[PDB]
Structures are given as C-alpha cells and as structure tokens.
Amino acid sequence: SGLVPRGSHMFYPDPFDVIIIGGGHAGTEAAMAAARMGQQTLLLTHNIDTLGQMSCNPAIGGIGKGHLVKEVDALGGLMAKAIDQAGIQFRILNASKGPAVRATRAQADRVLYRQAVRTALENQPNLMIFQQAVEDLIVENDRVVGAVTQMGLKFRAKAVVLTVGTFLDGKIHIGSIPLSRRLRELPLRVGRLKTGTPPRIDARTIDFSVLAQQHGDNPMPVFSFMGNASQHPQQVPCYITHTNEKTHDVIRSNLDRSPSIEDKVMRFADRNQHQIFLEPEGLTSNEIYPNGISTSLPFDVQMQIVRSMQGMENAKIVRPGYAIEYDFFDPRDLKPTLESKFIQGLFFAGQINGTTGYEEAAAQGLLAGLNAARLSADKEGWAPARSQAYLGVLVDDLCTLGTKEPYRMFTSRAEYRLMLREDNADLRLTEIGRELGLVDDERWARFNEKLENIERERQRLKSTWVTPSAEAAAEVNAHLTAPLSREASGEDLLRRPEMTYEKLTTLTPFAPALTDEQAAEQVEIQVKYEG
Amino acid sequence: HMFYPDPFDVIIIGGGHAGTEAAMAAARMGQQTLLLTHNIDTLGQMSCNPAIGGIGKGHLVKEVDALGGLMAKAIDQAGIQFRILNASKGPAVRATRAQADRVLYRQAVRTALENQPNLMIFQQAVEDLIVENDRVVGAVTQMGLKFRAKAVVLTVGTFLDGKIHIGSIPLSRRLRELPLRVGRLKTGTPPRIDARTIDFSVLAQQHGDNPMPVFSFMGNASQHPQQVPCYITHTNEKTHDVIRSNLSIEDKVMRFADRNQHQIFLEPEGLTSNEIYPNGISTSLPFDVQMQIVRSMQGMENAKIVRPGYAIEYDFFDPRDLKPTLESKFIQGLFFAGQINGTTGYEEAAAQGLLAGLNAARLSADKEGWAPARSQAYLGVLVDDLCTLGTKEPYRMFTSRAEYRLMLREDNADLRLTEIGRELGLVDDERWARFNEKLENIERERQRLKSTWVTPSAEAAAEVNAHLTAPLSREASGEDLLRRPEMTYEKLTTLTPFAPALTDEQAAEQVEIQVKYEG
C-alpha cells in the first residue's frame, strides 16, 4: 500500500523558551546558560554519550584560550569546572613574564571530561536533554518558532541556538537534510573548514625511557575561580619526541597523496625539528595523542611518519588519523549578540561560525544561550565590549571581520591589554553575570567575599606606615634595595620592584597575610600595575 | 590499497560481547590477534537492558569464567545489584543476575582488552574478507588496509545491514553468494526515562542479596561498586487502553489476558546516570504511544523521555551451516559467533565468542578444534542447538530440561571446564593454582567425612542427636548428617564430633551440594 503512517510526525506537548541544537562545547554552555537563568531549555543532541567530546587533542587552555575559559567561568559556565575534575596535567604558561601574558593549560582525561560534562547537564534544573538529530527549523515570518527532529517530532520554542551537527556537512578524508537547503537558500555565505587528526598510538609500543618528560606545575594551578587543587585527579607527564629529516623525506615522497605535519614540512627548514607531545588520552587509557602529526596522508605514510621518530620505532597505530571538511557560515551575517540577521530568534555559536577551538566555542555558546534566553523573556541581548573581555574581542572580530584574531598576534597586543588577564576575569564579569541571571549564589557569595578582602587589604596597606626610625625599620630595610630615609606605607613599599606581597606581610608592621590567596594576588597586581 | 606490515594468527571482526571474548581467548593462548572494531569507545556496550545473568544466561557467564574469559570479571567490577534467582529450588536451577553500570562495564571491558598481551585493537570498519581456495586468508578495511591471518572470527558490523525504526559492503554480497541462508531479526529498545521526573516515593524497591553474590570463581564481593535498588511500577488498564488503539509490550498485552498487571522494573543505567531503563515496555511503537504508555503508570505521570525507544532489523546467518566448532562449512578458517548467528543475548554471544576464538587460534596453530558436548556445558547445549535447530533453546524450556542436566550448574562450571581450559591454553597459573587448591579441599573434606563417624554409645552423640531431625538410629559417617534435609553444613560442622569447619567457603559450599545430591 501507499500508506505512510507518520506517527512520530507530531508536536511535543510542552513548549520551550530555548532550544539548543547540538551538544559540542558551544551547545553545552548555551544549554547550561539558558537553564540556569531559569528558562525552560531543550538540548537536542544526536548522542548523549559523546557530550564532552574533544575533537582534536585532549587539552584545554593555553594562550588566548585560557582567557576565554576564565571568562566562561566568571559568567557561571562549566568548562573550567569540568577541566578541574578531568585535568591530568596543569601548567601556567609564561609564568615569569607578567600577568597579561600568563595562561593556564591542562591536559584532559577524555573519560573524566565526558563524565563531568554529562553529569553536569543531567543535573541542570530547567534543562531537558533529548537524544535526536535535527531535520529542520520551523520558521514563520523570518522568525524561528521551533525545531523538527529526524524522527519527525517537533518542538516549539521562542528562541533557537544552532551549533554543530549533520546539517553542517562532514566529509572524512584519508589520502539532503532540509536544514542545509534552508540555510543555503538564505543569503548566507558558506565557507569550508578542514580540521584533522593524528593517528592514535598504543602506549605499550612506545619506548618512553629515551624521551624527555614534561610535568605540571607544583603547586597545581586551578582553572575555575571556584576550584581548589584537591579536586584534580591523578597527575601524569607528557613525553616528547621530534620530527627528524627521515620523517620529512617520508612526507615529501607522499605529497602526491593529498596545520598539517605536511604543511609544516613544506613551510619549514629541516634544521627545525618539530616537537611532538605525546599526550595521554586519559588515566585509564593506553592511547597516546601525538600532538604535532595531524595528516590527511594515507595510513601507510602515517605509520612511516610514526616509526621514523625516536621512541616510536615499534609503535602501533590504534585509531588512524584523517582530515574532516565541514561547511561553515560567515559570521559577519550575525548581530554582535550572535543572532542571525536573516532569521529572528536564531543564534549561531561555535563551528557553524568557522571557529575550531573548544574554548572559542564554549565562549560563543555561553553568549548565544544567554541572548536566546533574554529574547525568550522579551529582553534585549547583551554584546560584551572589546574592552570588557576577550569574549568581546572574539565576537566583535567574528561580526566585523568574519574571522577570529590569530594567536600569533596575541603577545604583541597583550601589552595594550593587561586589564584583560586570566586572573581578573571575575572582577571584570561576575557582576554583569549576576545581573543577567548567569551567576549562582555560591559564586556570588565567594566573589563578594573576595571583592571585600581586596578592598580591606588595600585600605589596610594605604594606612599602615613605617617611619624611618621605627623599631621595625631595620627589619624592613633588610628587604629593601636601599634603607628608608622617609616614611613609607605598605602600599609605597609594595610598589617597589624588589618587594612582594608575600615578603611585605611577613614584616612586623604589615603582618598578617591575607589567607584568601586569590585576593592577595590581586592586591599585589593592582598595587604594582597602577603606574 | 595497502598491506599491513605485520601478519596475524587471528583476526576478530566486531567488538561486541562475542568479539570481546574471542579476542581475549586467542590472545591469552599466545596467538597474535587483531580486534577490528568500528568504535573503541563502544567496547562493552549493552544493546538492551543493563544486566548480566539470569536463568541460563548466568550458567553461560560462569562457563565463560571457568575457561578464563572476561564477562564474569567485568560484571563483578560494574555490577550495582546482585541476586540469586531460585535460591530455594536446588542447584541446577539457581542463577546469578546483576544489574550493570553501563559506564563501569565499558571501562572494565576496554581496559581488559587494552592490557591483553598479544592483542592489537584497531578502529576501522571491515570492507570484505580475503578468500583464497575457499580458505580465509585475511580482511580488508574500509580505508583499503589489508590484514593477513590464518583464521578470522566474524561477529557483527555494517555488513549485517542494520536499519533503525520508530513505528552495500562487498562482504554482504560475498556471504550472500555463498549458499548461506539469510534471516531478519528485529530487536527493540524501550524509551529511556529521566530519573528526576519520576516519583520513586510511591514505588516498591528491589535490593540485591546480602551477602553479595560474586560471578567470577576468582572474585570477591569487595570488588563490587556501590549497590543500588531497582524500582517496580506496573502496567495497568489505562496502559492496555493505549496500546490497543495504536496497533515488546504491544505483542505481550495482545497475547495474554488483560486481567494481568505486568511488573515494570525501573533499572538504573548506572551510578553516575540519571537515566532509567523501564524493563518490560520495549516497543516498535511510535513516540506518541511511548509517552502515553510511560505517563500512564504509577510514578511516571510527569515522567520525561531522554532517548526514544526504537527497533533495529538485522541480517543473520542460519547457523545450521556451521560446524559445532563454529567454523563455517563454506569457507575454511572462518568462524561465526554472536549476533551474526541470530542470537541477541550478551551471555549467549560471549559464550560463542570464546569458542570461536579458541578454535580460530587452534586452527592457526594447526591444531584441532574443540566442539563441546551437550553433557559437558550449556555452551555445548547452545552450539548443538544453533548447529542443529538454527535457534537456541527457548528460556521457558530451561526449567523442565534441567531435570535431565543436573550436573550442569552455575556452581560447578570450573569442575566441568577449567581442566579443559588449561589443556587448551585458556587458563592462567593463578586460576589453575586456585582451582587445584579448591579441588583438593573438596577431596580431603569428603575423605575426612567418609572416615569421621559417630556411634549411639558416644559422649557427644547426645548433642548430635539433639540437633538431628529424626532419632539417631544405627551408626553413621560424617557424610550422613548432611545427606538428610534440615541438617546443613554450617550446622553440622559446629557440632563437636565433626568441628573442623572448612575454611574454603566455595569448596565447603560444594561439599554440601556434592553429598546432598548423590543418592
């Protein structure tokens, strides 16, 4: 018979304020954002068991990236808390260089990270998670009004965040869906992205005894303003090997066979051996992610590339490497709230916009979910200012230029920032966050206790003096470049290049030190860098 | 197209429950083994409810363990409720069953595979076999990489033609061109429910036994993680109303009287999961009917679905075209185990996986296979039945036919199979050492009971005829105060004329069983 029963081809009975399509990094922050603001939120994901998935290397943070994580955290997000649970090496980069430039980086255990994300989303009041791919949007008068799933089930919403998924495209490389059509038939400008993965290596087949180790910092960094280091699981080293000329010849013999290792070899000298960090995939995994050798070269070349390297002579590949190509849409077609200029109610976040980092995606997801929730409650959207946050710089660049600011530019431009350090993201953002509905009560309480600790200690330092012949003056002068010939406050002395907060508050007139270490640090930075 | 640099003795295709035991078996026998799976992160997946064991199933798991396999050890690590069924019914019929934590179970399985000497895992989909002279000689992956082997175990994969419902590989074509007989199997999963949306306060709880059972002969209870209850709700009049109109639970209401409330067990997907598996309402049914069935039940009026129920259809593979070793009659060196043979149970798959893997490894060492006998093991029952009938024995038949089996018990799978596993290279020193120890404690204890007596004219025969059921007639050996009901081992070995009570709980538990059922 010609009977098509279309029996799941129905409206869900309950409407939402916000629907999130996709559960990558962006959809995760968007869902958690809209829901913690109290809006009824739906998270549509094709696979609940891949929530928390990292597409490339298992790490979070570094230069620029770490900044975005701190900001996501300042605004009530999840990424920093998740990596505090899943993090298996923690390092501060540029630790001797001054605050605008320092960056936190952590290796993640893939399994702990999935668990941290999944369990956080499952316990989010106002959030329903539903496992389905999206077939299409429901649009009426240039306004989104809902989403249709593959199975035919339709959901009503006032606002929709589009993230990542099957509509984008996806073509795997080694060597249809009404949503794609709908978006293509708008004046949207399509690009192509070409991500890649290295082969994953079985750890039992690597000889680590010949390779250098790299440990995390001691004491351990914490990514979240709310964490402490006792939340971290067991810590492990990464080991290091290098590309050599044999590696480069293999690559060059195979260019015929289609941030690659091959692109790096074509563009670099030979005398420049590329560093390969053998990143553990987790504590309960024998797999290694060799950071530096992504290719779309065939498996046999990959094995030759691997076996040419020190320590790797007898190594075996567990998961082959490959390249992925996806469509994205030029983000200049978005408002700075991340709303589409073509469909009202529709917000774009993450790779849909042409970005690839986890952090860049989480920052956009937070913003998009915030503004979707705001629109569902008939409020105007928030667009962070360039001067307020790296999240502001990012979104501004996307909307104006179509593209993120390169990481190469980061060091140069940090000089004219410094108010945008990782370490003050809360002082820059937790207050707006609370007005927006993004900051919960634990964070609000701790933030204000910190804000008061800094004020109180600054005031104490401005009003505590040593006179140059006080009984305590010889103790003080011993820690000076030159003995005082005049009265100095705690703040006068702390502005001295040779003085630290920790040394100051060890001295009789200025003891005791603040026990709130985050406050202490911020007291020191404000004093030194007021100049 | 490219050849892999190193050749294998054995290739296992598919990492389901069959592939898992097949890979562990060949590899622990010392053969170089490849496991090809489409996804390493789904190793240890459970396609239906999150449980292991039960009637027949638990017998099979105990046999897997006796032969040095993984399934019993994995559920000991991941099991969040343990119960003995038919505990009051005598040993042939007693079965261990455990609810499983899905995440803990996958970890236990991936982790054991990743640390198995002689095994390489490789994430790729298979494209085809390599056949020369009606002999398998290797396999081709979808990216074009070719592996060489003397024996291949086929299990599960894209070649099986899986089509999902809510209301073409060269390997497919090759197998069809053989005179192999093809069937379609439809399996079903219920909707998965959000535990935050269910009122558990109005529902009865089911807890596991105390002390806790252990699946592995090599295990202890302190290996188990945190234990939790399942909750019971019930199908009702409103429920049968709903399945009526819109016409698994739908083929079980319209095949037995509506004067019956079906118990629905709310099974936890794990300790770190808010999802609930409602055992008893699987469906090919559409989502609308899924919501009405769910919401129509005590506890569940406000319940929300996280993952919709669906059905999948698969091809198998009439196993009447297999030898009792699980070798294909049409391609030499090719073994079939698990869902390819039309079985859906995890335990049935593991059992067949172990056999297919041992026989593929044997073939690769130019040795003869082992085809287990009906009277040896439930594994032999299952294979006999697949080979002869093309289907396993229906579970409703388990209980009658046990009368004719009696030596096939959970508790004695090691007695029946560990020496055989040893000889085949499947049993390790640690297990072999303990097995012989236990075997010895059983020997001495039945010796030191055929030769420890009591006469009516004896001092402690007054404390002995006191706890006894009938009046103490003539004289007796120690093998007699247990060979009669009411009188148990724990009771008997406290009474002073017999009071070195045996230190080995397992061997003691086996002395009781051995005497009390000898006649």
Curated annotation (Swiss-Prot), chain A:
Its main location: cytoplasm. SMART domains: GIDA_assoc_3. Keywords: Cytoplasm, FAD, Flavoprotein, NAD, tRNA processing. NAD(+) binds at residues 259-268. Gene3D superfamilies: FAD/NAD(P)-binding domain (3.50.50.60), GidA associated domain, C-terminal subdomain (1.10.150.570), tRNA uridine 5-carboxymethylaminomethyl modification enzyme MnmG/GidA (1.10.10.1800). It is found in: Cytoplasm. One of its GO terms (biological process) is tRNA wobble uridine modification. The keyword Iron-sulfur does not apply. GO terms for cellular component: cytosol; cytosolic tRNA wobble base thiouridylase complex. Signal peptide: none annotated. FAD binds at residues 22-27, 134, 176, 351. It comes from the Bacteria. Its cofactor is FAD. InterPro entries: FAD/NAD-bd_sf (IPR036188), GIDA_C_N (IPR049312), MnmG (IPR004416), MnmG-rel (IPR002218), MnmG-rel_CS (IPR020595), MnmG_C (IPR026904), MnmG_C_subdom (IPR047001), MnmG_C_subdom_sf (IPR044920). GO terms for molecular function: flavin adenine dinucleotide binding; protein homodimerization activity. Homodimer. Heterotetramer of two MnmE and two MnmG subunits. PANTHER family: GLUCOSE INHIBITED DIVISION PROTEIN A (PTHR11806), PROTEIN MTO1 HOMOLOG, MITOCHONDRIAL (PTHR11806:SF0). NAD-binding protein involved in the addition of a carboxymethylaminomethyl (cmnm) group at the wobble position (U34) of certain tRNAs, forming tRNA-cmnm(5)s(2)U34. Belongs to the MnmG family. NCBIfam families: mnmG_gidA (TIGR00136). This is tRNA uridine 5-carboxymethylaminomethyl modification enzyme MnmG. It comes from Escherichia coli (strain K12). The lineage of its organism: Bacteria, Pseudomonadati, Pseudomonadota, Gammaproteobacteria, Enterobacterales. The gene is mnmG.
